């Protein structure tokens, strides 16, 4: 499923991401934009044998199990396929663990390079939240 | 092994752009895929400086060294300091390494 900007902000707010670990909703919407372009089916293999999945591009090395990644930890205890549904519950739940690991949203490279330090609220402004 | 030039508490935003060599133990490890973060300390009850490995920016061979890393390992790290805003999750400084030496496994 390809979310609409405001559609996703509403879903994320509903799932309690607004100010989670101190990060305003805009951060989460902005991260999704540059990680997956709002596409929950988003799939990308890395040269190291790991893969990133879903709206927030969670990695298969430590966080989800995809059955083909060496050194798998599966800390989110969910199969990577569950991160592909049009229901973002799994991605949100896993992201909450990731963003609580001790480095904030610095776990997301796209957020670091495109969102961090910018006017992130712009990504939810207008929408009826 | 290069020679220590700063203590982790001595790594401050002022050093932005300059090369430093830190030496201590692995306080924390984070593997998030395209980004890996290793925190290094050399003094109990002191600062842990975040060392950053980012695909497309960090030399690929360092990602192998990181894979052999464990908490409490003693390391020596040469890298460039980059300044950041202090937050709940940001020390105000980051090190982008060019070398990562493992002196001792826990």
Residue numbers in the entry:
A (entry chain A): 1 to 129
B (entry chain B): 2 to 107
From the article:
We term these small, single-domain engineered binding proteins OBodies. To demonstrate the amenability of this new scaffold to engineering for new binding specificity, we developed a series of OBodies with increasing affinity to a model target protein, hen egg-white lysozyme (HEL).
In the third and final phase of affinity maturation, six residues in L4 of AM2EP06 were randomised and selections from this library resulted in the isolation of AM3L15 (KD = 30 nM) and AM3L09 (KD = 3 nM), constituting 8- and 83-fold improvements in affinity over AM2EP06, respectively. The highest affinity attained was 3 nM for variant AM3L09. In a general sense, the primary interface residues are the same: a hydrophobic patch at the centre of the interface composed of Y33, V36 and I38, surrounded by an inter-molecular hydrogen bond network and electrostatic interactions. In contrast to the NL8-HEL interface, the AM3L09-HEL interface shows an increased number of polar interactions, (going from 10 to 15 inter-molecular hydrogen bonds) and the addition of two salt bridges. Residues W90 and D91, located in L4 of AM3L09, together account for three hydrogen bonds, a salt bridge and burial of 195 Å2 at the interface. A very clear rigid-body shift relative to the NL8 binding position is also maintained in AM3L09. In addition to the protein atoms which interact directly, the AM3L09-HEL interface has a complement of highly-ordered water molecules which mediate both intra- and inter-domain interactions. In particular, two clusters of ordered solvent are closely involved with interface residues, with one anchoring the C-terminal end of L4, and another larger cluster arranged between critical binding residues Y33 and R35. Overall, the improvement in affinity, from 250 nM in AM2EP06, to 35 nM in AM3L15 and finally 3 nM in AM3L09 is correlated with the stabilisation and recruitment of L4 into progressively more substantive contact with HEL.
